[PDB]
């Protein structure tokens, strides 16, 4: 009984130090982006290459 009182009264470091962007999009808390169709399709093509596989905005 005293153990649960002192405490109360993988993905651990990614939720405390960083902010998951997919969590806000899957919950309806992220603003949509309309007009960047010529940039999103280019980032995917960069990650599927050998030389220069890191896009830099």
């Amino acid at each position: 009984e005293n153990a649960v009182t002192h405490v109360r009264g993988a993905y651990e470091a990614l939720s405390k130090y960083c902010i998951d962007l997919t969590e806000l999009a899957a919950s309806g808390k992220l603003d949509p982006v309309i007009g960047r169709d010529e940039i999103i399709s280019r980032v995917i093509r960069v990650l599927s290459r050998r030389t220069k596989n890191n896009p830099c905005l």
Binding site: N2, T5, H6, R8, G9
Partner: protein, 124 residues
């Protein structure tokens, strides 16, 4: 358990130990806490009884009779257990003076004074 105290709470428990020296006592009984709070003008324990509709004279007589029948008391360890539960109920982190007052209605040997004085547990 993390039973941290505030600045105002330490001024009451420390004064209750020295208050029993004049009344000829060799132990720290929890009944001496309500006596010190009633002896101070415009205190926190007195303002609570005025809003809940309770006679401060009949309550002081109840805790006075228990002190006479007395010869750190083990009862003080049980009083701090019920007072820590009120800290998480009010969505607070520290333990002030009002948190120690709500624990008086949980003990079977201390809730009788609140009933004869007109203090309801649901209204407190």
């Amino acid at each position: 358990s993390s039973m941290q105290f505030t600045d105002k709470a330490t001024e009451t428990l420390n004064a209750a130990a020295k208050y029993a020296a004049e009344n000829s006592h060799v132990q720290l009984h929890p009944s001496h806490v309500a006596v010190v709070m009633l002896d101070e003008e415009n205190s926190l324990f007195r303002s609570i009884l005025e809003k809940a509709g309770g006679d401060v004279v009949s309550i002081e007589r109840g805790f006075k009779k228990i002190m006479v029948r007395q010869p750190h008391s083990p009862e003080l360890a049980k009083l701090l257990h019920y007072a820590h539960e009120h800290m998480k109920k009010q969505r607070d982190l520290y333990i002030a003076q009002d948190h120690l007052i709500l624990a008086l209605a949980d003990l079977p040997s201390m809730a009788q004074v609140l009933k004869e004085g007109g203090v309801t547990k649901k209204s407190l």
